[PDB]
Structure 1
Amino acid sequence: PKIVNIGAVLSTRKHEQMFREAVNQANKRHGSWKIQLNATSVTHKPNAIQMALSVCEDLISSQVYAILVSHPPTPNDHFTPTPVSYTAGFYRIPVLGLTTRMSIYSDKSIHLSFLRTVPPYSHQSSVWFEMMRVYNWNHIILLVSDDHEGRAAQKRLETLLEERESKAEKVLQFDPGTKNVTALLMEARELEARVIILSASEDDAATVYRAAAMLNMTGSGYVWLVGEREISGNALRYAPDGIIGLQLINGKNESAHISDAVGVVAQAVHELLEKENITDPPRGCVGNTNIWKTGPLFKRVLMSSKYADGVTGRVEFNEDGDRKFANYSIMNLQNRKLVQVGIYNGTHVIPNDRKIIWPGGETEKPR
């Protein structure tokens, strides 16, 4: 009866409980004959020192094969995984994030021991790419954050725009923390195109919306295309009517992602302990300066795993650990109410019977 520990850092005590269930439920699902999956976990810490310290003292110390990182889906939490990733990445222990959508985790270096059940915001540009053409606009204005996250959605959208009739036109970028995006929009206003795509924080989207309206870029022939987040929080409070944003279906549904992540990890642990040339994970974090050799192997099996019937539906991973084929519900601001006017899944936009109102009030697609 081989005991295999699985660690998680989660939001609440009830989620710790939800994890303990989902694990030993998936334990009976697979078969407790050969291996028996064990759940050990800790409540999340917002203080990234105290957090990194907990991953050693509470998780890695008790022989863990992989860690799940969860936290409140708030914009001043979306980085509580960085310490966990760095600490566990030290020994090559795969970290399975399930809330955070920050693109820095999907980079080709730094977070090499990381994968997630939810796509980064930079992938919302794959929807915008389909959106363009479905509604036949193909000359756009683009403004991104000029922090990593912003350029990550620019670099992507513009890659898809290559090889294609549609071109970038003019890419503009602002300093992340600014009030005063006036002279930047002022320059965009006199430009050719009037379908604006935005990538910003909740409060930064708010600042451009606020200043866009003050410069009369808010209505008529203008189209505003954003993602989720640019229609969350204060961004919603100051958004122009007729803006098109997105929302990741099941994105904030933490109980779902605990269920699916335990799904793939259980499924991939059995897959792993079949190879029979594997080492046990280190119980270290104390003068232990060596990795476990079968670390990255487990990580490769992890992110090449295929797992349909998931509660977030058909969960498989990226070239570098991102969720593949995720469902975004297309949103639209009609009279201060976000109404589902479409739905993107994997690829392709599929609108419903309900009609879109465009920025300014006038129905019927602008140019």
Structure 2
Amino acid sequence: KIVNIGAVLSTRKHEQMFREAVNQANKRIQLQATSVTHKPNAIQMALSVCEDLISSQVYAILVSHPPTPNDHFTPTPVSYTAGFYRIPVLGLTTRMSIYSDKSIHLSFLRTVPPYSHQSSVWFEMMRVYNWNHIILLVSDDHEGRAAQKRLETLLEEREKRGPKAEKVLQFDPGTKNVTALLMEARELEARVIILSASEDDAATVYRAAAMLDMTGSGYVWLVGEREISGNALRYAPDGIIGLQLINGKNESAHISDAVGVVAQAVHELLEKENITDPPRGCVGNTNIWKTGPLFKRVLMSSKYADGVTGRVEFNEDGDRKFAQYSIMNLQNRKLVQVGIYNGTHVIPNDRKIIWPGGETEKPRGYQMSTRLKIVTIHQEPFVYVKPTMSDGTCKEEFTVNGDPVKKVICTGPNDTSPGSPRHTVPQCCYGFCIDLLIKLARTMQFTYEVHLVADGKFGTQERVQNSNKKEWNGMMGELLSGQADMIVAPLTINNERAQYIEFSKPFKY
């Protein structure tokens, strides 16, 4: 018989190219070609696909990216009207981040992998340069959350120190004050930043970083392909590392690969026993074509046709795996490919790679910041809270032994009240824990600046149904927030607080 493949194309030239491709692939039952141009709206597009369905309805509908950067509003209604009858849909070029949904899209095969592949190659590259701490941040809700989840899943392996995490951060695509998060970022240890924001978001981040000068020969950058555009390059400092997958804008090559893979798929499906061809009708066809599930299962199991994307293989997600990615960089506004990553082979191009900030040597890991922020609490037998004098110091009293009290000055909302909270004058405090911290500093040569907490709160795992998440609020909260470093207050031990943080050997019972 004849399997007339229904196809939708953005340009008539590509429609004629697909006609020539199917005419060439007919050499390998035969196959015909049904073509239809795209519509400006989803209503006319769906109506034309329904008119294209009543004609043949024996196909695996494919789609490509229009010149508009949406690439979703056109392929979505055809996928919906296909899944209405459990008909698979094929995708050549689009943002597979949102399209990677087995529930939304019934059967979808993306030729171009989503940014999960970018996160994977970022992890692979980080596993090479021995960098064990990364400051990641995302702006887009859906794509950013998916990339962060994929990164966390990849890091959940390995059950050296090993790169686990430094600080996860989310943002907005339309914000203009990312400097708030960038201050905390620069206040951390490792100068390894990775972002996956949008175009204008990346431009704003680049502007804020240039205002902060986040390129002092230590700031390693890893940027996705969604931000290597010239609009971002107008604000992007040189030396950053960009990504670019193979066969980016090769539309004809993608169409050739698609017609080849669907020819292989139809040749594999026509060898089965039961073939319930879908009815040539869009109206009244409120049933499920038996060729749908079986066709999906036989195309996803082992089918692999040659083409332009090399040894293409469909992973267990409906996406083409084992792709090639050109590892480019911003070597003085020149996107030179420092290497090519394909499958698992980390292959550098042996080019003279320069790091941002004029440095020619590979930047090391985090810089050990010899400065800690100690949080404490008011407790009579261990820590003391006394007001300072006029000049700012406090009366150096003595004991029966005549030894100095070696007091220290800690800034804390300690002199105010919970009724009128305000940043006080630094109060001078001393005690047992203070002397212990003095000994620790004299042993390890620290540069400390201790301070109390806002509302006491030794520690609480407060939970609520407003956000369905439980967070630590208090001294331990400030500790886990990132502003504090270590607890020197008389903190008790228990299985609850030992989950998030780890304690040391006791100095009292």
Class of the TM-score when normalised by the shorter of the 2 chains: over 0.9
Shift of 1:132: 0.6
Structure 1 residues 181 and 234: alpha-carbon distance in aligned structure 2, compared to 1, 3 A threshold: same
Partner of 1:32: none
Matches of 2:266 and 2:305, distance apart in 1? 17
Matches of 1:46 and 1:202, distance apart in 2? 25
- Where in structure 2 are the equivalents of 1:1-367 lying within 5 Å? 2-29=1-28, 35-59=29-53, 61-72=55-66, 74-164=68-158, 167-307=164-304, 309-366=306-363
Structure 1 residues 86 and 292: alpha-carbon distance in aligned structure 2, compared to 1, 3 A threshold: same
Deviations 1:325-363 (A, max 9, x none): 000100101121211111100123211121211121211
Matches of 2:313 and 2:151, distance apart in 1? 23
Shift of 1:275: 0.6
Matches of 2:7 and 2:216, distance apart in 1? 47
Shift of 1:291: 2.3
Structure 1 residues 206 and 365: alpha-carbon distance in aligned structure 2, compared to 1, 3 A threshold: same
Q: Which has the higher strand share?
A: 1
Matches of 1:159 and 1:314, distance apart in 2? 26
Structure 1 residues 316 and 291: alpha-carbon distance in aligned structure 2, compared to 1, 3 A threshold: same
Shift of 1:265: 0.6
Alignment check: 8 A CA contact 2:57 2:279 kept: yes
Matches of 1:331 and 1:346, distance apart in 2? 17
Structure 1 residues 27 and 245: alpha-carbon distance in aligned structure 2, compared to 1, 3 A threshold: same
Shift of 1:204: 1.8
Moved more, 272-281 or 36-45: 36-45
Shift of 1:364: 1.5
What are the ranges of 5 or more consecutive residues in structure 2 without an aligned counterpart?
Answer: 364-509
Deviations 1:49-73 (A, max 9, x none): 3333332223464323211111236
Deviations 1:260-314 (A, max 9, x none): 1111110110110111301111322223222212212112222234335312211
Matches of 1:280 and 1:262, distance apart in 2? 20
Alignment check: 8 A CA contact 1:123 1:153 kept: no
Matches of 1:66 and 1:158, distance apart in 2? 35
Structure 1 residues 300 and 330: alpha-carbon distance in aligned structure 2, compared to 1, 3 A threshold: same
Structure 1 residues 281 and 51: alpha-carbon distance in aligned structure 2, compared to 1, 3 A threshold: same
Identity of aligned residues (%): 99
Matches of 2:178 and 2:55, distance apart in 1? 49
Matches of 1:197 and 1:273, distance apart in 2? 48
SS at match of 2:245: coil
SS at match of 1:299: helix
Alignment check: 8 A CA contact 1:143 1:199 kept: yes
SS at match of 1:335: coil
Structure 1 residues 60 and 360: alpha-carbon distance in aligned structure 2, compared to 1, 3 A threshold: farther
Moved more, 307-316 or 346-355: 307-316
Structure 1 residues 302 and 60: alpha-carbon distance in aligned structure 2, compared to 1, 3 A threshold: farther
Larger Rg: 2
SS at match of 1:341: strand
Deviations 1:202-244 (A, max 9, x none): 2222221122211222442101101211213423332221111
SS at match of 1:134: coil
Alignment check: 8 A CA contact 2:6 2:34 kept: yes
SS at match of 1:28: coil
Alignment check: 8 A CA contact 1:209 1:240 kept: yes
Structure 1 residues 46 and 150: alpha-carbon distance in aligned structure 2, compared to 1, 3 A threshold: farther
Structure 1 residues 233 and 57: alpha-carbon distance in aligned structure 2, compared to 1, 3 A threshold: farther
Alignment check: 8 A CA contact 2:261 2:305 kept: no
The alignment's TM-score, normalised by the length of structure 2, stands at: 0.67
Moved more, 114-123 or 65-74: 65-74
Alignment check: 8 A CA contact 2:261 2:304 kept: yes
> How many corresponding residue pairs?
359
The alignment's TM-score, normalised by the length of structure 1, stands at: 0.92
Moved more, 345-354 or 45-54: 45-54
Moved more, 57-66 or 217-226: 57-66
Matches of 1:162 and 1:60, distance apart in 2? 49
Structure 1 residues 115 and 309: alpha-carbon distance in aligned structure 2, compared to 1, 3 A threshold: closer
Alignment check: 8 A CA contact 2:244 2:325 kept: yes
Moved more, 313-322 or 55-64: 55-64
SS at match of 1:197: strand
Matches of 1:262 and 1:221, distance apart in 2? 48
SS at match of 2:361: coil
Alignment check: 8 A CA contact 1:73 1:252 kept: no
Moved more, 319-328 or 186-195: 186-195
Moved more, 320-329 or 227-236: 227-236
Alignment check: 8 A CA contact 2:60 2:90 kept: yes
Deviations 1:168-190 (A, max 9, x none): 21111112333332212222121
Provide runs of 4+ in structure 1 moved above 6 Å: none
Structure 1 residues 124 and 314: alpha-carbon distance in aligned structure 2, compared to 1, 3 A threshold: same
Alignment check: 8 A CA contact 1:341 1:351 kept: yes
Alignment check: 8 A CA contact 1:264 1:305 kept: no
Moved more, 120-129 or 285-294: 285-294
SS at match of 1:172: coil
Shift of 1:78: 4.6
Matches of 1:142 and 1:46, distance apart in 2? 38
Shift of 1:195: 1.0
Structure 1 residues 229 and 361: alpha-carbon distance in aligned structure 2, compared to 1, 3 A threshold: same
Structure 1 residues 291 and 178: alpha-carbon distance in aligned structure 2, compared to 1, 3 A threshold: farther
Alignment check: 8 A CA contact 1:60 1:88 kept: no
Structure 1 residues 266 and 141: alpha-carbon distance in aligned structure 2, compared to 1, 3 A threshold: same
Structure 1 residues 304 and 237: alpha-carbon distance in aligned structure 2, compared to 1, 3 A threshold: farther
Matches of 1:251 and 1:101, distance apart in 2? 12
Matches of 1:60 and 1:228, distance apart in 2? 40
Matches of 2:54 and 2:100, distance apart in 1? 23
Structure 1 residues 356 and 48: alpha-carbon distance in aligned structure 2, compared to 1, 3 A threshold: farther
Structure 1 residues 261 and 291: alpha-carbon distance in aligned structure 2, compared to 1, 3 A threshold: same
